[PDB]
Structure formats: structure tokens, C-alpha cells
């Protein structure tokens, strides 16, 4: 197949700046049948560019496609703050038809280490038969942070769920929550609960913990 | 050319048949060759779309037998004969009749249940505190603090779908640690589908 490889995964720019997204093909794309899609939060995709460099009708001036065969760029010449979303490339020259994994445009802002907190499960939740432990990363950037649960110093694996906010409307940071979920039966078999957070803006990892009672 | 889908969200028991309709504002039947320029897409959270059907009814390579579109002219249908856990996703129809590919608004598909939320205090041993809204279906839940009086330093996280087939989320607020003795903090969870509001006071 033609596999389309988008670069980079996330591009960090300020409104007004020009963006150059890249779509690299494993195999020459026939007749430059290369299309670009916009996709906004909770919306169906939008055709932006087709035939490598043809701007679709209703698409503004500032979006333009460039390149042929294996090397393609989408240039957004004067960035509007609504434009910061996911962009997909997609070829229609040869079956099977497959999407690029996507490039997400996010707003650039310095670097901020997270404010970390941990919460023990409530008595009411333990009586209902389940134990959810929450680790909170507060107002950080960039989004790339590693959250590791340690239960009696034992690194946990795939029994925890992370949720991350949309980038903040005032200071352009993220908050993130990790929830480690055990049965009451299992939760009460261990003493120390810790979330260790590695983030780029920290000199070294910060650990947050509690002993049950 | 405008694509309208219905229903917009679909709850079907596991293994049952699921049906989504797509209607075009104009015929996408091409008189001269007798072909429908209609396609179907699957899109799962945090992933690109996956082409399933095109020419209204032709399955793309590696699309399972249970996926089958039908109908032509202005009214079309995608049916999943034996619905599985892995088929839970968003589905779009797309017209390529005219060099202006347009998608429907999309249809969410999920597993039936219908439960109200559970709220618990997130409180530890500036200070942070919060609410955990656990085991609810369907979406959505709206969380406020002190009936929308407190909004500064609030973060309410996007919901996640648990192994249960039920949703869970968290809402947190950072407050002056000095104020924890005096000012009240109440989180208000409105779940419009279960016809419920729950107000949990969170204490230190």
C-alpha cells in the first residue's frame, strides 16, 4: 500500500505565524491524487486541498498545498486561533485508501512544570466496593508528561486511566488526571500509594504518595 | 451537496444489529454509469478515519463481512449485522459525486445501559479538592461548582469509557488553603439523560 507519514506529530506555533505540515509517501502517489483534511473537535472532516495543490471551494486564501509524488506540504500562511486543530493527508491514487496518522497544531508558550496532588478514595466509594486513586497534574506544558503508579514501591501497568483537558483558554496550559482503579478487596491488600511524575520542566521526577490511614 | 445522518447517537445491545441512515440534499446516482458516489467511514477516539464502504455498497479491502451499506439516489444505509465491542466508534457518510467531498455530521454508536451518576469527594490527607463522577450512561454530564459561582482555577476533565460500558470523569478546583475552614465548596453534577442533578459538598 501507499503509507502516508505525517511530520511532525504536533507543531507548536503562535497565531499570525505560518505553519508547514509534511506528508511523506512510502510509494509515488499517481496523478498527485493527494488530499488534505481539517478536523475540529467534535466535527466531521473537511476537505481543504485536493490534487496536491488545488484549494477546494469555500476554503480561505491562507491554506495552500505544495509538492509531488512522495513529498507534500500544507502551508497555513497566517494562522487564525480557530485553525489550531488536527490536519490529515490521504491519497486516492491506489487501493487501499489510508489516512496519515495526523498533525495537530497547538499554541506555543514557554515551558511549565506541573503542580501535583494525590487523592485517597472516599469512605463512601470503599463501602460501594471499588477504590479509585486520583493523581492530578495542574497547569503544565508541553502535554508530554509520564505518570507512573507505585503501590508498595511496585511500578503498576495498565490498571490506570489518564484524562487530559483541552489547552487552557487563559494561559494555554494542560491539566491531566490519572485514576488507578482497584476493587476494595485488592486496594486493602497494599499500604503505600504513590504517583511518580516525570515532566520536561522538572529537574527530576516529583513523587506524591499516601499510606492508607 | 449536504449529507444528513440519523440517528445522531445509537445504543444497541452487544451482538445485535445496528442501522445508520444517510440522506443527500441532491441525487448522487450518476445517470450515465449507474453508480452511487457515496462512501462510509469509521473513526475511533484519537485516530484517523478508516474507509469502510464506497460506491454505496462495495466493502474496501479488510473490512469485515458484517459491515454492509445499501440504498441509492438520495437515501442510503450502513448496517452492522453482528455488533461487537471493537465496532464502538463514530460513523460518517461522504459524497464524492462532485469535487467537494462532504461528510454527514456523524453518528456515535454504543452499548445500552441507562444509569444515573455516582459522586465522591476528591479530598487529600493553595490546596486542591474535587469531585469524582463515576459509573454513568449515557453522555453527557455537566459539572459546576457552587452553582457556577466558582469558576477560577477549575478543571473538569473529559469523560472516559470504562470496561463496564459506563462513563467516569473528575472535576477539580484549587482554592486558598486558609479558606478551607470557612467557605463552602459544592460540586453540582447535572445528568440530563437520567433526569438527575447531584450536589456533593467536598470537605478537608
Amino acid at each position: 500500500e501507499i503509507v502516508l507519514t505525517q511530520s511532525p506529530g504536533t507543531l507548536s506555533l503562535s497565531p499570525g505565524e505560518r505553519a508547514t505540515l509534511s506528508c511523506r509517501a512510502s510509494q509515488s502517489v499517481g496523478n498527485n491524487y493527494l488530499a488534505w483534511f481539517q478536523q475540529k473537535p467534535g466535527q466531521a472532516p473537511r476537505l481543504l486541498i485536493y490534487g496536491a495543490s488545488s484549494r477546494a471551494t469555500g476554503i480561505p486564501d491562507r491554506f495552500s498545498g505544495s509538492g509531488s509524488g512522495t513529498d507534500f506540504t500544507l502551508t497555513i500562511s497566517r494562522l487564525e486561533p480557530e485553525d489550531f486543530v488536527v490536519y490529515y493527508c490521504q491519497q486516492y491514487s491506489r487501493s487501499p485508501y489510508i489516512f496519515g496518522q495526523g498533525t495537530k497544531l497547538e499554541i506555543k508558550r514557554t515551558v511549565a512544570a506541573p503542580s501535583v496532588f494525590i487523592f485517597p478514595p472516599s469512605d463512601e466509594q470503599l463501602k460501594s466496593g471499588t477504590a479509585s486513586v486520583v493523581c492530578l497534574l495542574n497547569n503544565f506544558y508541553p502535554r508530554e508528561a509520564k505518570v507512573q503508579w507505585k503501590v508498595d514501591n511496585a511500578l503498576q501497568s495498565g490498571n490506570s486511566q489518564e484524562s487530559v483537558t483541552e489547552q487552557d483558554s487563559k494561559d494555554s496550559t494542560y491539566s491531566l488526571s490519572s485514576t488507578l482503579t482497584l476493587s476494595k478487596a485488592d486496594y486493602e491488600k497494599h499500604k503505600v500509594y504513590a504517583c511518580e511524575v516525570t515532566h520536561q520542566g522538572l529537574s527530576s521526577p516529583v513523587t506524591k504518595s499516601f499510606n492508607r490511614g | 451537496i449536504v449529507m444528513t445522518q440519523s440517528p445522531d447517537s445509537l445504543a444497541v445491545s452487544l451482538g445485535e444489529r445496528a442501522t445508520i441512515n444517510c440522506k443527500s440534499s441532491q441525487s448522487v446516482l450518476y445517470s450515465s454509469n449507474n453508480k452511487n458516489y457515496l462512501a462510509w467511514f469509521q473513526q475511533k477516539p484519537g485516530q484517523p478515519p478508516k474507509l469502510l464502504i464506497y460506491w454505496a455498497s462495495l466493502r474496501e479491502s479488510g473490512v469485515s463481512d458484517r459491515f454492509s451499506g445499501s440504498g441509492s439516489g438520495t437515501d442510503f444505509t450502513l448496517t452492522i449485522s453482528g455488533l461487537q465491542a471493537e465496532d464502538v466508534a463514530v460513523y460518517y457518510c461522504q459524497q464524492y459525486y462532485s469535487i467537494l467531498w462532504t461528510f454527514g455530521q456523524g453518528t456515535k454508536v454504543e452499548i445500552k445501559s441507562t444509569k444515573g451518576p455516582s459522586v465522591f469527594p476528591l479530598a487529600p490527607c493553595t490546596a486542591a479538592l474535587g469531585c469524582l463522577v463515576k459509573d454513568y450512561f449515557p453522555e453527557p454530564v455537566t459539572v459546576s461548582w457552587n452553582s457556577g459561582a466558582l469558576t477560577s482555577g477549575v478543571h473538569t476533565f473529559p469523560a472516559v469509557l470504562q470496561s463496564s460500558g459506563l462513563y467516569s470523569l473528575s472535576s477539580v478546583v484549587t482554592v486558598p488553603s486558609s479558606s478551607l475552614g470557612t467557605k463552602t465548596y459544592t460540586c453540582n453534577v447535572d445528568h440530563k439523560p437520567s433526569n438527575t442533578k447531584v450536589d456533593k459538598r467536598v470537605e478537608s
Binding site: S14, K108, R109, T110, A112, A113, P114, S115, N139, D171, S172, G201, L202, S203 | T126, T174
Partner: protein, 213 residues
């Protein structure tokens, strides 16, 4: 229109402690991370520490990490640096700075000079420099103060063009500097010329008029 004003700079005994204060004005203080930076005699810049806006966080180099304490008071709009186990290496001038939500370090305090020497505080004697009898040159010699720095001006800063204020020289554990000013030959002594010396370390100010002999 932003102002960061450091205070507490001066001499300290080795092994003792020092506190710097920084008062910020003309920007929503409780909305920003604030940082300390220092510059040794050797002119290298050394990042020290930072704070997120809730003092519920810190970012400090290891080197120091376990030696200084950084902290802040929102309502009072003031930033603090506590040093303990003070040494030779801590002799530098210290800069207060904003951390900025879309721009790294756009705002620096003028900087406050910290000296670590058992030496005793001393005020300067100020001596005018007038000719033995196109353009005329005058000066004043500021002898025997400790520690650095002084601030020297001419006619309360109104004469700043054609001024040369020379780097101090250390001599018998006391500093000496000179400052020169050049004006048109008919301007002096027809019009009055005074050099003004503030020595913040002794809380003194001296205004010495230049006298024809």
C-alpha cells in the same frame, strides 16, 4: 511600565544566611511564575530557582537545590530568596525576573549586588577634581567605601551626556572610583556643577560642588 525592585543586597559573613526581597508592580502578579538569576564577577549567568504562581511548586538547579529557599506573598506582591550556609561562590549580583506565559524572561530587576566578607561597612569621602587654573573637564574621586556598589550622577542626572564613570578599584579592603564630566569651557565656573554619590550600604548621600582654585 513594569517594575521589579530587589532589596537586601550588601555584605554577609561566610557560613551565615541572606534574604533578598523583590517587589513587582504593573502586572497581575498572582498570574505568573517568578525566577531568580545571578551573575558572578566572571560575568557567567547562573539560573537559580523559579516558582509557579501558588508557591505550591519550585524549579531550582541541583548545585543549590538543598541550599536556598525561594518563596512569595501574592497580596504583598513580593518575591523572596533565602540563602543558608553562604560561601565564596555566592558572591554575585542577584536578578529578580518574571517567567512569562508566551515569552520566557521579558522583565529583569536592575540587580542587587551581594558581597560575602567579614569586612566592616564604611562610607566614602568625596573629593572634587578642578583644574590647576573649547571644552572643560571636571571630576570627583570617591575614596574608601565598602561594600560595592555606589551610584554616581552629575547635577541629579541632568548631565549624563559626556560623562565617564570609571570601574572602582579595591585597596586596603576599601573601594575607590572616579567620575569625569566634559562641558563647554564658558559653562563652568559661570554655571554650577555638583557630583552626587549615594552609598546604599551606609544609607548616605553626598553632593560635592566642584571649586575653582
Amino acid at each position: 511600565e513594569v517594575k521589579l525592585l530587589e532589596s537586601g543586597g550588601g555584605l554577609v559573613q561566610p557560613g551565615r544566611s541572606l534574604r533578598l526581597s523583590c517587589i513587582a508592580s504593573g502586572f497581575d502578579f498572582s498570574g505568573y511564575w517568578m525566577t531568580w538569576v545571578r551573575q558572578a564577577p566572571g560575568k557567567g549567568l547562573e539560573w537559580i530557582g523559579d516558582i509557579n504562581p501558588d508557591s505550591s511548586t519550585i524549579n531550582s538547579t541541583p548545585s543549590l537545590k538543598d541550599k536556598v529557599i525561594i518563596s512569595r506573598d501574592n497580596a504583598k506582591n513580593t518575591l523572596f530568596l533565602q540563602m543558608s550556609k553562604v560561601r565564596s561562590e555566592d558572591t554575585a549580583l542577584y536578578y529578580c525576573a518574571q517567567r512569562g506565559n508566551y515569552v520566557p524572561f521579558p522583565y529583569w530587576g536592575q540587580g542587587t549586588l551581594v558581597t560575602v566578607s567579614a569586612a566592616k561597612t564604611t562610607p566614602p569621602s568625596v573629593y572634587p577634581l578642578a583644574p590647576g587654573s573649547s571644552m572643560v573637564t571636571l571630576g570627583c574621586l570617591v575614596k574608601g567605601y565598602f561594600p560595592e556598589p555606589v551610584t554616581v550622577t552629575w547635577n541629579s542626572g541632568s548631565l549624563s551626556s559626556g560623562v565617564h564613570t570609571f570601574p572602582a578599584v579595591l585597596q586596603s579592603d576599601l573601594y575607590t572610583l572616579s567620575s569625569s564630566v566634559t562641558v563647554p569651557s564658558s559653562t563652568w565656573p559661570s554655571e554650577t556643577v555638583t557630583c552626587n554619590v549615594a552609598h546604599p550600604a551606609s544609607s548616605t548621600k553626598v553632593d560635592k560642588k566642584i571649586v575653582p582654585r
